[PDB]
Amino acid sequence: MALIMEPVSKWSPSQVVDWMKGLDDCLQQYIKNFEREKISGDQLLRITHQELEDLGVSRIGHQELILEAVDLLCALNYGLETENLKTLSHKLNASAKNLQNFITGRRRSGHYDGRTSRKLPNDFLTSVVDLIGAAKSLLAWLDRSPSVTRNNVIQLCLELTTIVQQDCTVYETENKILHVCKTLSGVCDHIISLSSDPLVSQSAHLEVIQLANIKPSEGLGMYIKSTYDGLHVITGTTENSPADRCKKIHAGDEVIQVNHQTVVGWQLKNLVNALREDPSGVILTLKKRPQ
Amino acid sequence: GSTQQDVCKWLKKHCPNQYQLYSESFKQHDITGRALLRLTDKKLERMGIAQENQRQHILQQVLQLKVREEVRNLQLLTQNLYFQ
């Protein structure tokens, strides 16, 4: 929300380079050119391949690093105000439906050899994987809100993983996957039907929270996990800590800015540096769950 | 999060045919662990694997690896850090 934070689309080139300084060491060689071209948060959110190449980024590993950061930037600018449990459930049911219609589709085509081949096409893996992603996202949202049914999805996602690893004909692999698909959805519907109708549509918000240290460079007293997806997530605080007493930092919160600097795609290293910079306190912009 | 040299050895292990032909494209483009997992047919063509035939086999391993990561990720969901 524009009261707590200024849109990424409003960032100046300086603001762009600033956030770029906390990304991977191997990408700094480029910020010189981003500078010179006056690349703004505007253009950044939609940077294209050809643009990355003109900025000097040939090694598409380096490209992918940048775009994975900018993808996170997009989740923040468009998604935070938007993503709710309904959204997430729709995305899960959708990727399962599409998988199903994929399977039954393949099977009526003239070129089908699924009853003979055990060679599983790459479509299948990307689909299965993507669906498992949808289910993990649903569950990461469920944990920060109001156990049996949590194991369900986990098992179901696992049944998927073992299905595509079985030295199996593809018709049988397809029957097995088709089954997981139908039930995974049903579980998803059930999770929804069991959900309070005020929370189920609410999305997350931002908050500013100011800490005050009481000794030079003291522990603020929070524990922070940095997910592979890039997230910096507070997992808990410690008693009699600034963080604990402020009553405003909670497990599940995600560090969005540190001292008014967006640290979203950052390497733990540089986030750590950010948090430590001022021994006297820290301003945290936290992504807060609707609960 | 595995190293660039790590990837190269993973390719020699799982994509032997492709390594003789296309070892260098992974070196030239600095395909780290995080980068390998984001890889797609269209991207692979951009690093210079011109033949769709070979591109398939590389993703067949990339995706089979992506799958194995999800077994470990999903197991974890049933069982690093930093502190300030």
Swiss-Prot record, chain A:
The chain holds residues 1 to 298 of 1032 of the full protein. It is found in: Cytoplasm; Membrane. Interacts with RAF1, RAB2L and RAL GTPase proteins. Belongs to the CNKSR family. The gene is Cnksr2. Phosphorylated on tyrosine. Residues 11-76 form the SAM domain. Residues 84-171 form the CRIC domain. It comes from Mus musculus. Residues 208-290 form the PDZ domain. It comes from the Eukaryota. May function as an adapter protein or regulator of Ras signaling pathways. The modification Phosphoserine is found at S12. This is Connector enhancer of kinase suppressor of ras 2.
From Swiss-Prot, chain B:
Disulfide bonds: none annotated. Residues 3-68 form the SAM domain. Transmembrane segments: none annotated. This is Sterile alpha motif domain-containing protein 12. The chain holds residues 78 to 154 of 161 of the full protein.
